[PDB]
Amino acid sequence: SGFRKMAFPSGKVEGCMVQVTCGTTTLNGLWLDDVVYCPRHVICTSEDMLNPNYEDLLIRKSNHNFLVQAGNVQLRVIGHSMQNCVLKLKVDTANPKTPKYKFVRIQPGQTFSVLACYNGSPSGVYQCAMRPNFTIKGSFLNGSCGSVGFNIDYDCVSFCYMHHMELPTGVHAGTDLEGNFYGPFVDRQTAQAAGTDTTITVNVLAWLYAAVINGDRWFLNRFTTTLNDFNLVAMKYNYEPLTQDHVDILGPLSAQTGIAVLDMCASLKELLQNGMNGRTILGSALLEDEFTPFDVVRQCSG
Amino acid sequence: SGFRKMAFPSGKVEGCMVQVTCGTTTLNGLWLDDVVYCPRHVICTSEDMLNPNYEDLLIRKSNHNFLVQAGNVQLRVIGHSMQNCVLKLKVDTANPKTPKYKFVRIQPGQTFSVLACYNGSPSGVYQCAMRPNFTIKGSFLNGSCGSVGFNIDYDCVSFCYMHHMELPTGVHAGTDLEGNFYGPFVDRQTAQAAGTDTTITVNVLAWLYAAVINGDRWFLNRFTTTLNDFNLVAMKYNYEPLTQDHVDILGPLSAQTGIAVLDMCASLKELLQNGMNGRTILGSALLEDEFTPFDVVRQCSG
Numbered sequence: 001s002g003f004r005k006m007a008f009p010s011g012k013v014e015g016c017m018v019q020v021t022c023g024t025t026t027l028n029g030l031w032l033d034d035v036v037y038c039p040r041h042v043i044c045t046s047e048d049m050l051n052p053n054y055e056d057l058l059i060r061k062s063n064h065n066f067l068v069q070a071g072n073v074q075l076r077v078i079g080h081s082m083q084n085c086v087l088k089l090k091v092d093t094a095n096p097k098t099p100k101y102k103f104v105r106i107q108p109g110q111t112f113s114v115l116a117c118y119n120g121s122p123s124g125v126y127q128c129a130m131r132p133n134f135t136i137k138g139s140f141l142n143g144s145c146g147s148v149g150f151n152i153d154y155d156c157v158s159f160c161y162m163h164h165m166e167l168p169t170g171v172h173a174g175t176d177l178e179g180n181f182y183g184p185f186v187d188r189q190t191a192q193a194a195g196t197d198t199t200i201t202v203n204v205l206a207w208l209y210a211a212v213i214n215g216d217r218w219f220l221n222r223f224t225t226t227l228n229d230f231n232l233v234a235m236k237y238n239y240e241p242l243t244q245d246h247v248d249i250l251g252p253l254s255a256q257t258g259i260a261v262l263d264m265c266a267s268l269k270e271l272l273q274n275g276m277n278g279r280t281i282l283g284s285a286l287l288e289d290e291f292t293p294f295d296v297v298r299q300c301s302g
Numbered sequence: 303s304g305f306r307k308m309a310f311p312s313g314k315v316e317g318c319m320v321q322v323t324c325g326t327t328t329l330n331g332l333w334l335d336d337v338v339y340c341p342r343h344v345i346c347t348s349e350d351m352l353n354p355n356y357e358d359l360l361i362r363k364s365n366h367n368f369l370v371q372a373g374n375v376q377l378r379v380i381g382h383s384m385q386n387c388v389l390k391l392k393v394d395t396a397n398p399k400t401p402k403y404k405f406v407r408i409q410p411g412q413t414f415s416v417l418a419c420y421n422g423s424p425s426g427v428y429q430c431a432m433r434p435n436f437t438i439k440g441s442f443l444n445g446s447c448g449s450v451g452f453n454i455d456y457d458c459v460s461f462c463y464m465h466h467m468e469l470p471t472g473v474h475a476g477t478d479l480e481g482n483f484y485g486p487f488v489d490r491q492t493a494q495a496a497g498t499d500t501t502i503t504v505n506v507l508a509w510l511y512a513a514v515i516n517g518d519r520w521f522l523n524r525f526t527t528t529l530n531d532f533n534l535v536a537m538k539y540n541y542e543p544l545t546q547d548h549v550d551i552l553g554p555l556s557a558q559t560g561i562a563v564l565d566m567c568a569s570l571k572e573l574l575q576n577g578m579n580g581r582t583i584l585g586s587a588l589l590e591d592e593f594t595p596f597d598v599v600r601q602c603s604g
């Protein structure tokens with residue numbers, strides 16, 4: 001037993017991290033087969049970043065301006081294109097360590113592992129969630145751009161995130177691996193607004209189930225509630241409205257613990273209205289919404 | 303910016319995880335050069351675990367009883383010995399992916415990455431700390447035994463932990479890679495007592511420095527205190543007494559932030575005596591002691 005914010009094992013992704021240099025600027029890139037993916041603002045100079053015309057900037061560029069280094073093996077660039085906010089650098093050698101992979105655009109609320117990188121070398125690994133407002137709360141210093149997020153299913157890496165920018169608010173924003181930003185963000189150094197970030201209600205319920213499984217039962221109570229009335233409380237407290245789909249997904253947790261979803265909802269209501277009065281749940285003095293039902297199932301059965 | 307519980311990248315260690323089977327029992331093992339390290343209670347049957355005579359049990363055993371599988375490559379066992387609470391299985395083939403490694407016995411308070419494994423396959427990765435009482439708070443299900451903890455310096459994996467057991471209290475205990483338990487624990491299924499677990503004071507101070515670096519300054523106050531009087535407060539609250547060595551180690555953090563260590567100590571005193579009154583520090587409603595000064599330096603400079 002025990003419960004931890006657990007990342008996926010990062011080796012399959014380690015073998016794909018490269019360094020990409022365009023003039024003075026250096027960031028990370030993702031080498032899969034014979035294509036290297038990286039943020040297009042690699043082609044900007046520091047002043048270019050306030051109002052960059054990416055097409056015009058890319059036009060001044062030719063294949064040989066893009067220095068791509070994998071460890072120390074230098075890669076020869078044979079083609080270059082711009083897809084949305086990513087650069088696709090066609091190179092001459094397929095990555096021999098390309099794992100089986102897919103590009104997926106994840107849904108707000110889902111989670112993924114991030115492998116923070118600098119200069120094409122991996123720094124560290126941590127789990128995080130696409131927030132309802134399409135930001136993420138991570139750990140990214142200058143040069144970490146192009147670090148990727150991913151899930152691992154079976155034998156297959158599903159890349160879902162590439163990091164592009166730190167907002168003035170200190171949270172982080174980026175794209176899918178087709179270069180479409182998550183959220184309303186654009187890759188210009190202008191001040192930009194992340195909306196209201198609500199709490200992922202279904203995730204908090206899955207976390208309470210994990211807590212029950214692991215001995216923490218003090219929040220279990222003699223009440224229940226209803227989807228509609230619970231949701232009234234959820235709206236008071238900037239929680240995501242709960243739906244029948246969310247209830248179904250909590251099915252297996254309900255069944256293994258023998259606690260109806262709506263009863264757990266009443267417990268959560270009580271916590272929302274009366275706080276935690278100084279106790280803890282699975283080691284935290286706050287309600288945790290960055291575990292999905294699937295995360296709990298995965299960790300509680302190996 | 304941003305601050306996260308970050309694990310080391312796990313690939314170098316992924317390439318060393320094997321599966322070890324002795325009769326009915328299966329757990330994980332660590333293949334470095336031509337030696338496989340695993341917990342000796344692999345040689346026990348479920349009933350054997352209450353009062354096992356490990357020497358006698360090992361004597362009934364020969365090289366060919368030990369089924370060692372790396373992925374699907376089966377390893378031939380050519381020698382076997384017991385070192386403290388680990389089995390050293392000499393095999394015929396050196397691990398081609400052996401990284402540069404060392405065995406180190408870490409000190410309470412230091413941290414490391416854990417790669418949780420089942421059936422010799424890696425499940426996930428997370429950071430954790432050797433608590434002052436030599437337990438760890440992790441995520442370990444049956445079959446996770448032999449999962450290892452490690453740090454990565456430069457180009458070199460320093461293995462410090464192998465997981466052996468879950469205490470009835472739900473925390474976790476294990477050995478160094480020479481098979482010496484951390485703490486007073488023995489590998490018998492008897493009830494065993496982890497002592498009082500105090501809080502790692504120097505780690506909490508490093509965390510407050512990280513918080514300051516990242517915008518959270520609300521706990522900074524107009525006081526200071528003294529090593530002795532601070533330590534009186536620390537003792538009231540089951541914190542580790544702070545020493546001049548701890549102060550020196552916080553040197554670089556002090557210098558980069560321009561905050562004297564004793565001033566940060568006065569802030570921490572105030573937090574200990576008056577709580578947090580419902581606010582948060584780097585996203586947590588509790589004082590965090592599982593970052594070392596070195597962890598903060600590492601994450602805040604890349």
Ligand SMILES: O=C(Cc1cccnc1)N(Cc1cccc(Cl)c1)c1ccc(-c2cn[nH]c2)cc1
Nearest residue numbers: 025044045046140141142164165166187188189
């Ligand atoms: O945030 C970042 C990157 C970052 C920093 C720290 C942590 N994470 C990400 N910016 C600001 C920013 C603002 C608005 C939109 C975006 Cl896309 C980026 C950034 C990006 C590129 C350059 C640059 C230098 N030479 N050429 C281009 C300079 C600043």
Ligand SMILES: O=C(Cc1cccnc1)N(Cc1cccc(Cl)c1)c1ccc(-c2cn[nH]c2)cc1
Nearest residue numbers: 327346347348442443444466467468489490491
């Ligand atoms: O805790 C664990 C392992 C564990 C479980 C879950 C998470 N982590 C670790 N035990 C109990 C225990 C008690 C006291 C001392 C120790 Cl060393 C182990 C355990 C170990 C081996 C066997 C066994 C089965 N067949 N042969 C041997 C059975 C139980």
